[PDB]
């Protein structure tokens, strides 16, 4: 059959699939005292998509559409646009437009508008809070609270690019974002739709494997953590590759050119996540030039090594 | 003999800009002959080798780290830079100028970030780098930042440009900015740019290269917002991973419409790593938004392609 493969990047060389920054770490924890879900950077080794999920590293929690002011407050409504300009289509079976944020949490960016006729060009400091009520992607809706009052024109193309999150100061520290809650993709009281399954450990001493990076703290006492099931880059690849899983889990060693041994090794299931063998917490120390390799595919089984 | 060489099997929609990070919109071919075609971003043989600033992240391009110090009475900022993993910047090594760094002329603006590693504060203003300006000497590892404030970023505390759009003067003519196909002074003036991935151009008759396009976003004023580059992020991505051994000076590429089945064009995919096909004039082209690029043979210096109309 065709032969499965993970890319060989470093954790440093790759991206994370879930804010478009890159990845910084690997971290292991315990995931039952909170529910993961993500929508972004899921993929079946075999290179299907699921929830949210897309390709481009860059149009992850970003937004196209256009705008209408909101008498008397800084606040604007964007009309959703699918990635190519398209309209959104919210009978799509997709828990949200693709590369919607798939976290609670204020995001802050800027706002970008070019103006068709004379080309005219501005842009504002702005953030979307994805727990507010206003928040309702899945609908082609969302909105955004801004620098100004009256400079954004109706009917012209209107870009979010994100930047970094933020946090009230006054208030307790790291309490926002919350990395492991789902948005109200459709606004209060209505359900979240076709998402991406959860995930958990389904073996007796193992944790999940969270590829790691600390999103940018634009104020506040932001918590940065931001931890995805798969590198964006391994999305990318397997979704090109397209080849068959032939076992329950896919057996990969970490490996150290430095030196050429083995590092530890962890379980890539299918459905697209990573399990490593420990028990607590523990930020991975790993050689710098480090890699994952393929190695071979074992069942549900398989005992790992332990990883230290 | 050896690994066989391809083309990943992504739309132009699909794919990312190589030279600023923003998806790739349109496919673009003119004349290259009345400016200079020599980006430092987006540079890759099809056998894998990574030329002038060109690195891997497509998320990585035109950023900046490092950490800042004030311009006392001014709301610039001057920002000493680090290596992407927040190591130390060496200027010795062998490279135009740090990976990554903006490969045009103009006024990129966007978003300091600093984080205060004792309390884990964060604040974060709106800033603009001219690539242009005699500060901008990014391969001396300095960089220069004009800004919101003037106060509050701290010394020695870890900060991240994260860039957003161009920008230009709306008083002065339009369009007249940024440059995209002028290189900056890498190493300030007085110094001649150094290790640059080589100029390119057609060599055959009736050819012109073939632009990967996307639009930048303007921040303000009337800037120049086309940005073209000669490899798709993911195409340089993919040739480093491949590192499949070019057997011939040029890889003739179709580019297929699958509902249908027909090929659309055919390009020359040039192992130095820059495409181009048979037209002469401006064009747009017009294209199956699902159609994608398919590597057929290798073929010589001298195969005649087919007009792509």
Known sequence: TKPFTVPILTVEEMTNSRFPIPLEKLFTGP????????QNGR???DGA????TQLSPVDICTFRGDVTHIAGTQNYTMNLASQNWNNYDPTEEIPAPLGTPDFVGKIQGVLTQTTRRDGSTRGHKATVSTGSVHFTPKLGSVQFSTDTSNDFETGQNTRFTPVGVVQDGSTTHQNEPQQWVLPDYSGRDSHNVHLAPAVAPTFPGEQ??????TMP???GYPNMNLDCLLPQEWVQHFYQESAPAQSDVALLRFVNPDTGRVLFECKLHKSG???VAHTGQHDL????????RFDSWVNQFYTLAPMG
């Open 31 to 38: 995931s039952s005292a909170f529910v993961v879900q993500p």
């Open 208 to 213: 999940l494997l969270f590829f790691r990076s």
């Open 285 to 292: 120390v790993i050689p710098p030039n480090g890699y994952f």
């Open 43 to 45: 993929c079946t080794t």
């Open 217 to 219: 703290g634009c104020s």
């Open 273 to 275: 996540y990573v399990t």
């Open 49 to 52: 998509l699921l929830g949210t």
